[PDB]
Amino acid sequence: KVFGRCELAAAMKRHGLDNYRGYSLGNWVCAAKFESNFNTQATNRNTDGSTDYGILQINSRWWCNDGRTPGSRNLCNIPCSALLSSDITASVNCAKKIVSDGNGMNAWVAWRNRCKGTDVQAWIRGCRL
Ligand code: NA
DSSP, X not given: OBOOHHHHHHHHHHTTOTTBTTBOHHHHHHHHHHHHTTBTTOEEEOTTSOEEETTTTEETTTTOBOXXXXXXXXXXXXXXXXXXXXXXXXXXXXXXXXXXXXSGGGGSHHHHHHTTXXXXXXXXXXXOO
């Protein structure tokens, strides 16, 4: 599923991401935009052989099991394919664990390089939330 901007914002808000660990909703929408272009089916391979999955590009090195990342962890206790669903519940719940692991949203390279220090509230302007 390719989400609309306000559609995604409303779904992230319903799943409790607005101000989760102090990150306003605009941060999460900005992160999703530059991680996946709002596409739940997005995948990308990393140099070490791991793969990033879904709207928030969650990594198989630590967070999910894709059967092709030997020696890795599955801290969200899910198959990585679950992160590609049109239902974003698994991505949001796993994202909550990542952002809580001490590094905050700096875990997402696109957020640090393209969202951090900008006017992230612009990403929810116009939405009925
Ligand atoms: Na893994």
